RNA sequence: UGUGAAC
């Protein structure tokens, strides 16, 4: 509840010259008291009278009613920031060293010197792209400083380290003044031209870094990064985090977790000697020297101090620095520069071609329906993203323009223009529009915004390839339901004194022009073999079209902006945007490693314990018939680099016997680490989400970083949420949502009142609020209705439906119409209409919570029903598992030590049910977990019609609707759906082993009947409650269940009518991955 | 309608 108290202090701190607490209650008489109190406060304020008497008079309202929000009557002129800043601006401003960056525009030159005229200006290279201002961030940091001004002992030290650092931001900012943002939170030319170009982005990165500073080490790191960053905007992250790849190889392994036959983590007390050739040390030194040549001093020394003994115990610092460098900011260059960087491949091409054949051999020979109806599948899959050009479109009786892919397909079909048989060119005549990918520390890459013809021609085939990968282990990122822990387990498994790991970064090779010929040719060669495997007209054409996309790309041309011009240049490299991007890249990366390993063996003899490709990295584990020496590692390494070199591939290739480092994860000293570099006050690009969506995302970002080792003060995060979630009523009237409105599990949830613990209404007022918020979940959009009524639209929905099913439509048909009515949300005008409606509904709701016919059951209601039938009792669970993920906070880590962890993802889509499998065999349609959930619970006769309506044969439809499996699917679908509603795969929970024997003992549930659904919820509810207590208290409890038999039948009915909740908090988890 | 592909 501390959030509400914190909000008042912040408002009082921000405004000084009134606040009006607004309450509400589920009890009629109490609510009137709430209404009376609100009126009196407004009246007293409208008379400059003391509200002290009213608070005493309506003590009962303060005591029992629930705080809904807070009114903010502030008559200033959004200044204060200018006034506040000066006290902290005593230090000497920073002077940009305009000689550090290559490309001139990457140097912190005055904005004007980069864009002499307002028409040449662009924030494209520094846009924070976030719906929160620099001024607000400054206010937030200062508010925190004032609060922890009179702190003591170590808390004071944290404040002192922070006050210093913020002085640098303040001193530098004051020298030019605080950049004023516009309604869209953008920084225009007039505000910008006086100040240094990167001033605002740099401030956001520095503020984010300093508020995440605690120990002296954090302070040393933050200070170096902040100062260096102001001048260097292109190699500081790379220089700072480059020594990590060398370091993982150094640390010794003293007991680590491995993967057993049951694909689960298991402790192994083994010891593995880290063997490092002297050459590696020279390479590490050059890296350290390079950091030094760039001004770095404190960070280089820390790596150096660590290097004396290299203890996994003092490794945390190395990890901390690696996470830290990313928070310098994104490297946003100019489209042209990002674009510009871009006989022995016979073995490599053949492998790519063979791999393509294996993944589609069976689907093609059989005459897979999905391959035959590939076009239909592409249409259903189709998104609402950009197609490339902004077309003029006529809907019903309205002429509007859009770039949306969904919109383009409908307009073309309604005008005989829809022609997926013809795969448009992407050369000099029809240049590919370009998109961009910005990441911290790494160089900017370009993106192909190809026409929808390409997505349809590639969607069915890519899915078939993914399915092959799903059950192929070499493909770490696609295998089974696995998570990163299993991958961590696999590398450690075979580590011994007679084996060495070989990791390699292949991000540069994928963009290499050397790469593109063997790539497209390899896929095409594979496609021809597949074509000679069948005669099916549908299969050959879908297969043939795929061949065409590769051929068109072979020689493409790109539209690269160059100021306010769009120079068209011949791009001869494999950029990404295709449907086969990830699958193809994976196939290629794996093919490349196989090629390198094969070449090397002619010289040395080793065993291939494991080979893996995961993202932009690939690796292998080799076993030699003798003990590995420093000399052996050098010889293997030189040859591997040499093999890569002959192929003209600029890749990083290292060889060790203890660790490995890759973009997604790193394994040092037998432990697993995950970079914690998600930026907070700076985004990659601008989207269409709201401020509330953004606040939820920032919190989500904060949670992931905190789990990964990077923690930003919670109070600062809370302060940001308060600014972001507020709503202006007028110019001097601002409304701030309460903790209850923000955290309760509703459609407006932004964060959990307590980190790592998700609460669900257990009081009437909480329930009353939850029901009210849902009442106004989805808002109307005129523009969306018009187009939803247009002919071209209905025909498109009708055309899709008549191509899919055979018999009758509606559970499926109603869905297709909506799925399409939604895709119109990418369309700004529609998105804008929805937001305005949401704010007005929200403004009224905060003012005085409306009524609601309810009648809609949710997850919270099911939980609320159960709660009262459990008896708690202190219990004890000894810690028995060693730590493998060193960065986890203490409360989260403790649960793992006691109950354990898992290496998989709980099925939350229902894709593993028989009905879903049956639909898949005959239909290209893909029902969601929710649709499957409604369908399974239907009358036997109805289910048979639905399966047949989708193309499922009668002998098959009939056999299923009675069988054991159908009854079983019922339980499995609900189980999958419930896990989905409980976020058992996100945040903290995704880590915990929900089937721990130790966890199980704490749950005593006596069966008083035997009805699967009820049994499953009671055990799950108990496991979550027991775990949450452990997260919040550190000690365990035992749960006993005395749930009636009469009660269980009522509960079971309730279970099959649960409504899913949509909210910023829900969206944020989806957003993360 | 400052809007920028596969996931």
Coordinates of C-alpha atoms in Angstrom, one line a residue, chain A residues 429-687:
Chain A
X429 CA 12.2 -1.3 -61.2
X430 CA 10.5 -2.1 -57.9
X431 CA 13.0 -1.1 -55.1
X432 CA 12.4 -2.7 -51.6
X433 CA 11.2 -0.1 -49.0
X434 CA 13.4 -0.2 -45.9
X435 CA 12.9 -0.7 -42.2
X436 CA 15.5 -0.5 -39.4
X437 CA 16.6 -2.5 -36.4
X438 CA 18.3 -0.6 -33.6
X439 CA 20.1 -2.3 -30.7
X440 CA 22.5 -1.1 -28.0
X441 CA 26.2 -1.7 -28.6
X442 CA 25.7 -3.2 -32.0
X443 CA 25.5 -1.6 -35.5
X444 CA 22.2 -0.6 -37.1
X445 CA 20.8 -3.1 -39.6
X446 CA 18.2 -2.6 -42.3
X447 CA 14.9 -4.4 -42.9
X448 CA 13.1 -5.4 -46.1
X449 CA 9.4 -4.3 -46.1
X450 CA 8.5 -6.7 -48.9
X451 CA 4.9 -6.9 -50.4
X452 CA 2.4 -9.3 -48.9
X453 CA 2.9 -11.6 -51.9
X454 CA 6.2 -12.7 -50.2
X455 CA 4.6 -13.5 -46.8
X456 CA 1.9 -15.7 -48.3
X457 CA 4.3 -17.5 -50.6
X458 CA 6.5 -18.3 -47.6
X459 CA 4.2 -18.8 -44.6
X460 CA 3.2 -22.4 -45.1
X461 CA 6.7 -23.7 -45.9
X462 CA 8.4 -21.9 -43.0
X463 CA 5.9 -23.4 -40.5
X464 CA 6.7 -26.9 -41.8
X465 CA 10.4 -26.1 -41.3
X466 CA 9.8 -24.9 -37.8
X467 CA 7.9 -28.1 -37.0
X468 CA 10.9 -30.1 -38.1
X469 CA 13.1 -27.9 -35.8
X470 CA 10.7 -28.3 -32.9
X471 CA 11.8 -31.9 -32.6
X472 CA 15.4 -31.4 -33.7
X473 CA 17.8 -30.5 -30.9
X474 CA 20.5 -28.7 -33.0
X475 CA 17.9 -26.0 -33.1
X476 CA 18.2 -24.7 -29.5
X477 CA 15.6 -21.9 -30.0
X478 CA 12.9 -24.1 -31.5
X479 CA 13.3 -27.5 -29.8
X480 CA 10.4 -28.9 -27.7
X481 CA 8.9 -26.6 -25.1
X482 CA 12.4 -26.1 -23.7
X483 CA 13.7 -22.9 -22.2
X484 CA 17.2 -21.5 -21.8
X485 CA 18.0 -23.7 -18.8
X486 CA 18.0 -26.8 -20.8
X487 CA 20.5 -25.2 -23.3
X488 CA 22.7 -24.3 -20.3
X489 CA 22.4 -27.9 -19.1
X490 CA 23.5 -29.3 -22.5
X491 CA 26.8 -27.5 -22.8
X492 CA 27.8 -28.4 -19.2
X493 CA 26.8 -32.1 -19.6
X494 CA 29.8 -33.2 -21.6
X495 CA 32.4 -30.8 -20.2
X496 CA 35.5 -32.7 -19.0
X497 CA 39.3 -32.6 -19.2
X498 CA 39.2 -34.2 -22.7
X499 CA 36.7 -32.0 -24.4
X500 CA 36.6 -28.3 -25.5
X501 CA 33.7 -26.0 -26.4
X502 CA 33.7 -24.0 -29.6
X503 CA 31.4 -20.9 -29.6
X504 CA 31.1 -18.5 -32.5
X505 CA 29.3 -15.2 -33.2
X506 CA 28.0 -15.3 -36.8
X507 CA 26.0 -12.0 -36.9
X508 CA 28.5 -10.5 -39.4
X509 CA 28.4 -13.4 -41.8
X510 CA 24.6 -13.4 -42.2
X511 CA 24.9 -9.8 -43.5
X512 CA 27.9 -10.7 -45.8
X513 CA 27.4 -10.5 -49.6
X514 CA 29.7 -13.6 -49.8
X515 CA 26.8 -15.4 -48.0
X516 CA 23.9 -14.5 -50.2
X517 CA 24.8 -16.5 -53.3
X518 CA 25.3 -19.9 -51.5
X519 CA 22.3 -19.1 -49.4
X520 CA 19.5 -18.6 -51.9
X521 CA 21.0 -21.1 -54.2
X522 CA 21.1 -23.7 -51.4
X523 CA 17.4 -23.2 -50.6
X524 CA 16.4 -23.3 -54.3
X525 CA 18.4 -26.4 -55.0
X526 CA 16.5 -28.0 -52.1
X527 CA 13.2 -26.8 -53.4
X528 CA 13.8 -28.4 -56.8
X529 CA 14.4 -31.8 -55.2
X530 CA 11.2 -31.4 -53.2
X531 CA 9.3 -30.6 -56.3
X532 CA 10.6 -33.8 -58.0
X533 CA 9.0 -35.6 -55.0
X534 CA 5.4 -35.1 -55.9
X535 CA 3.0 -34.2 -58.8
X536 CA 0.4 -32.4 -56.7
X537 CA -0.7 -29.3 -58.5
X538 CA -1.3 -27.4 -55.2
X539 CA 2.0 -28.6 -53.7
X540 CA 4.2 -27.7 -56.7
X541 CA 2.7 -24.2 -57.1
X542 CA 3.1 -23.4 -53.4
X543 CA 6.6 -24.9 -53.5
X544 CA 7.3 -23.1 -56.9
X545 CA 6.2 -19.7 -55.6
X546 CA 8.7 -20.1 -52.7
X547 CA 11.4 -20.8 -55.3
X548 CA 10.4 -17.5 -57.0
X549 CA 10.8 -15.4 -53.8
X550 CA 14.4 -16.6 -53.5
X551 CA 15.1 -15.9 -57.2
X552 CA 13.7 -12.3 -57.0
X553 CA 15.8 -11.6 -53.9
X554 CA 19.0 -12.9 -55.4
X555 CA 19.3 -9.5 -57.2
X556 CA 17.4 -6.9 -55.2
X557 CA 17.5 -3.1 -55.0
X558 CA 16.8 -0.9 -52.0
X559 CA 15.3 2.5 -51.4
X560 CA 17.7 4.2 -49.0
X561 CA 16.7 7.7 -47.8
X562 CA 19.5 10.2 -48.0
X563 CA 18.2 13.4 -46.4
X564 CA 14.9 14.1 -48.1
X565 CA 15.8 12.0 -51.1
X566 CA 15.4 8.3 -51.7
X567 CA 18.4 7.1 -53.6
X568 CA 17.9 3.6 -55.0
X569 CA 20.9 1.3 -54.6
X570 CA 21.6 -2.3 -55.6
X571 CA 21.7 -4.3 -52.3
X572 CA 23.4 -7.6 -52.7
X573 CA 23.2 -8.9 -49.1
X574 CA 20.7 -11.0 -47.2
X575 CA 18.8 -8.5 -45.0
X576 CA 15.8 -9.7 -42.9
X577 CA 12.1 -9.2 -43.2
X578 CA 11.1 -12.4 -44.9
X579 CA 9.1 -15.1 -43.2
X580 CA 12.0 -17.5 -43.4
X581 CA 14.3 -15.1 -41.7
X582 CA 14.8 -16.9 -38.4
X583 CA 14.4 -20.4 -39.8
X584 CA 16.7 -19.8 -42.8
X585 CA 19.3 -18.1 -40.7
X586 CA 19.2 -21.0 -38.3
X587 CA 19.6 -23.5 -41.2
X588 CA 22.4 -21.5 -42.6
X589 CA 24.2 -21.0 -39.2
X590 CA 24.0 -24.7 -38.5
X591 CA 25.2 -25.5 -42.0
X592 CA 28.2 -23.2 -41.5
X593 CA 29.3 -24.8 -38.3
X594 CA 29.0 -28.3 -39.8
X595 CA 31.2 -27.1 -42.6
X596 CA 33.9 -25.7 -40.2
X597 CA 34.0 -28.8 -38.1
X598 CA 34.3 -31.1 -41.1
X599 CA 37.2 -29.2 -42.5
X600 CA 39.1 -29.2 -39.1
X601 CA 38.9 -32.9 -38.5
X602 CA 41.1 -33.7 -41.5
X603 CA 43.8 -32.4 -39.1
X604 CA 42.6 -33.3 -35.6
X605 CA 40.5 -36.2 -34.3
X606 CA 37.6 -35.3 -32.0
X607 CA 34.1 -36.4 -31.2
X608 CA 30.9 -34.3 -31.8
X609 CA 29.2 -34.5 -28.4
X610 CA 26.8 -31.7 -29.5
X611 CA 26.3 -29.1 -32.2
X612 CA 24.0 -26.1 -31.8
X613 CA 22.7 -23.0 -33.5
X614 CA 20.7 -20.5 -31.5
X615 CA 20.1 -17.1 -32.9
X616 CA 23.1 -15.3 -34.2
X617 CA 25.5 -17.7 -32.5
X618 CA 26.4 -21.4 -33.0
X619 CA 28.5 -23.8 -31.0
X620 CA 29.8 -27.3 -30.5
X621 CA 31.4 -29.6 -27.9
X622 CA 34.3 -31.8 -29.1
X623 CA 35.9 -34.8 -27.4
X624 CA 39.5 -35.8 -28.0
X625 CA 41.2 -39.2 -27.3
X626 CA 43.7 -37.4 -25.1
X627 CA 43.8 -34.7 -22.5
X628 CA 43.4 -31.2 -23.7
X629 CA 46.4 -28.8 -23.4
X630 CA 46.9 -25.1 -23.9
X631 CA 48.7 -26.0 -27.1
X632 CA 45.8 -28.1 -28.3
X633 CA 43.3 -25.3 -27.8
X634 CA 45.5 -22.9 -29.8
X635 CA 45.9 -25.4 -32.7
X636 CA 42.1 -26.1 -32.9
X637 CA 41.4 -22.4 -32.6
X638 CA 43.8 -21.2 -35.3
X639 CA 42.4 -23.8 -37.8
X640 CA 38.8 -22.9 -37.1
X641 CA 39.5 -19.2 -37.5
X642 CA 41.4 -20.0 -40.6
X643 CA 38.6 -22.1 -42.0
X644 CA 36.2 -19.2 -41.4
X645 CA 38.7 -16.9 -43.0
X646 CA 39.0 -18.8 -46.2
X647 CA 35.2 -18.6 -46.6
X648 CA 35.6 -14.8 -46.2
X649 CA 33.5 -14.7 -43.1
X650 CA 34.2 -12.0 -40.5
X651 CA 33.2 -13.9 -37.4
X652 CA 34.3 -14.2 -33.8
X653 CA 35.5 -17.7 -33.0
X654 CA 36.7 -18.8 -29.5
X655 CA 37.6 -22.2 -28.0
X656 CA 37.5 -23.1 -24.3
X657 CA 36.8 -26.0 -21.9
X658 CA 34.6 -24.3 -19.3
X659 CA 32.4 -21.5 -20.7
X660 CA 30.7 -19.9 -23.7
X661 CA 29.2 -16.6 -24.6
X662 CA 26.3 -15.8 -27.0
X663 CA 23.8 -13.0 -27.5
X664 CA 21.1 -14.7 -25.4
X665 CA 23.0 -16.4 -22.6
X666 CA 26.5 -16.9 -21.1
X667 CA 28.0 -19.7 -19.0
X668 CA 30.9 -18.8 -16.7
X669 CA 32.2 -21.0 -13.9
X670 CA 29.5 -23.6 -14.5
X671 CA 26.9 -21.0 -13.7
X672 CA 24.4 -19.4 -16.1
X673 CA 24.1 -15.6 -16.8
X674 CA 21.7 -13.5 -18.8
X675 CA 22.7 -9.9 -19.8
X676 CA 20.5 -7.4 -18.0
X677 CA 20.7 -4.6 -20.6
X678 CA 17.1 -3.6 -21.3
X679 CA 16.9 0.2 -21.7
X680 CA 14.3 1.9 -19.6
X681 CA 14.0 5.6 -20.5
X682 CA 14.9 5.1 -24.2
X683 CA 13.2 2.8 -26.7
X684 CA 14.3 1.4 -30.1
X685 CA 11.3 2.8 -32.0
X686 CA 7.9 4.4 -31.6
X687 CA 4.8 2.2 -31.6

